[PDB]
Amino acid sequence: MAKLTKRMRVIREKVDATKQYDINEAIALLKELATAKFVESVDVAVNLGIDARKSDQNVRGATVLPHGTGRSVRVAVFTQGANAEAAKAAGAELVGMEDLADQIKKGEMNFDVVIASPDAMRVVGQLGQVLGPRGLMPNPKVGTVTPNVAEAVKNAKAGQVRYRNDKNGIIHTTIGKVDFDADKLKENLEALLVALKKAKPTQAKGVYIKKVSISTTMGAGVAVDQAGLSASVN
Amino acid sequence: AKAPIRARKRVRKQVSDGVAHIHASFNNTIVTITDRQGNALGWATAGGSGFRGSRKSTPFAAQVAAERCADAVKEYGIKNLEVMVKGPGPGRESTIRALNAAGFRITNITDVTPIPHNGCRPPKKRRV
RNA sequence: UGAGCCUUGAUGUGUAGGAUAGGUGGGAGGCUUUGAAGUGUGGACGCCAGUCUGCAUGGAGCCGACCUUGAAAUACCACC
């Protein structure tokens, strides 16, 4: 959206300058530009020069960050037959069929992630294409569709973050909280980077990364010169 | 029944005011609307109303030719008219009446009918 | 003078819906002249004068994880 208002203006005044920045001085700048009473979350926009056509010329799936976000990652379990205590012991909030099949039909899902079974997907989620930003319907390409539900639930709650294309090459991915130190953030950044390179198609060997910019929630963003290869600020 | 159509907004030249020209001959009437600076915004005829024979050169077939052109030029956004008359043919007044029924003041009925200084010889017609 | 590429910035005006349905991650809210809204001024902009929006003034609002309607659902920051 990025609507131009008063409460945004203040943030645009308090910044010193806009330019493409070194990744470490962007993170240390970006941390000043949070404004909220809520602790903001930090993510990166990586623009890929790839076609982004279905899957084959796309980068789609997930990785486990070595360090988790300071949020829980609000997990549900959409399935046709599981033990509630066993999935809940893995960390799930709700296990069922009916309540999740209602939400994804209704067009509002109370959870940020649903781990889905192939059997759950089949009735609701397999046809859905235009799924919006709360990201309710399933995908296989993301890898949230697995019969091994309790492993992906425990890994979601501990630090698993996703990467996907939109209709474009653009990858949004979660890097941490503004609570965190600079190094610990670089360590999460660099884990995503090996994952976008591991998933990269055989044809995508020209110019790949077109542009980088890193963002905080209610606060601003700072555009990035590049991602770099280091898990340490130093 | 009604459909959900977008709003109409179009422009052509928005002239607001004009001159009209009436060419009356012996077999037909030709009736023509223009801008006052001189550009055609449409025309109609009495022959294209299909009366044919003698009936084609009458005040009434001439009137309905005037109401046909005068309807079409609302799209050009003309709102007032003045008229130029050029001929001895029928539709002397009836042509005028049809522009005045188009909702115009027609205060200036300027006969400009060219009287050549005795021009070119007209056709003999029948051989007796 | 078309189109592409690209920096930012924005509309989808419908039918149900307060009203504002480009693909979608972060994500449970923001309090410089309440984020507003509003005649007025410039720009985007309609399935139609109404949504977003610079701004003297205006402190009357958006809207979700959760007002509610829905087949895509909306804050707010990004991508455009």
Swiss-Prot record, chain A:
Highest taxon of source: Bacteria
Keyword Endoplasmic reticulum: no
UniProt-listed Gene3D superfamilies: 3.30.190.20, 3.40.50.790
Keyword Nucleotide-binding: no
Gene Ontology BP term (one): negative regulation of translational initiation
Modified residues (N6-succinyllysine): 105, 154, 186, 197
InterPro entries per UniProt: Ribosom_uL1_bac-type, Ribosomal_uL1, Ribosomal_uL1-like, Ribosomal_uL1/biogenesis, Ribosomal_uL1_3-a/b-sand, Ribosomal_uL1_CS
UniProt entry keywords in alphabetical sequence: Repressor, Ribonucleoprotein, Ribosomal protein, RNA-binding, rRNA-binding, Translation regulation, tRNA-binding
Family annotation (PROSITE patterns): RIBOSOMAL_L1 (PS01199)
Annotated GO MF terms: rRNA binding; structural constituent of ribosome; tRNA binding
GO CC terms, sorted: cytoplasm; cytosol; cytosolic large ribosomal subunit
Purpose of the protein: One of the primary rRNA binding proteins, it binds very close to the 3'-end of the 23S rRNA. Forms part of the L1 stalk. It is often not seen in high-resolution crystal structures, but can be seen in cryo_EM and 3D reconstruction models. These indicate that the distal end of the stalk moves by approximately 20 angstroms. This stalk movement is thought to be coupled to movement of deacylated tRNA into and out of the E site, and thus to participate in tRNA translocation. Contacts the P and E site tRNAs. Protein L1 is also a translational repressor protein, it controls the translation of the L11 operon by binding to its mRNA.
Subunit structure: Part of the 50S ribosomal subunit. Cross-links to the P and E site tRNAs.
Protein name, per record: Large ribosomal subunit protein uL1
Organism per entry: Escherichia coli (strain K12)
Annotated gene: rplA
Curated annotation (Swiss-Prot), chain B:
Residue(s) carrying N-methylalanine: 1
A molecular function (GO) term: structural constituent of ribosome
Record bears the keyword RNA-binding: yes
GO cellular component: cytoplasm; cytosol; cytosolic small ribosomal subunit
Source domain of life: Bacteria
UniProt KW keywords: Methylation, Ribonucleoprotein, Ribosomal protein, RNA-binding, rRNA-binding
GO biological process terms on file: cytoplasmic translation; translation
NCBIfam families noted in UniProt: PRK05309.1, uS11_bact
HAMAP family: Ribosomal_uS11
Note: Has been predicted to contact the N-terminal domain of IF-3 based on footprint studies; exactly how IF-3 interacts with the 30S subunit is controversial.
Record function comment: Located on the platform of the 30S subunit, it bridges several disparate RNA helices of the 16S rRNA. Forms part of the Shine-Dalgarno cleft in the 70S ribosome.
Entry's family note: Belongs to the universal ribosomal protein uS11 family.
Subunit structure: Part of the 30S ribosomal subunit. Interacts with proteins uS7 and bS18. Cross-links to IF-3. In stalled ribosomes contacts ribosome rescue factor SmrB.
Name of this chain's protein: Small ribosomal subunit protein uS11
Organism: Escherichia coli (strain K12)
Protein's gene: rpsK
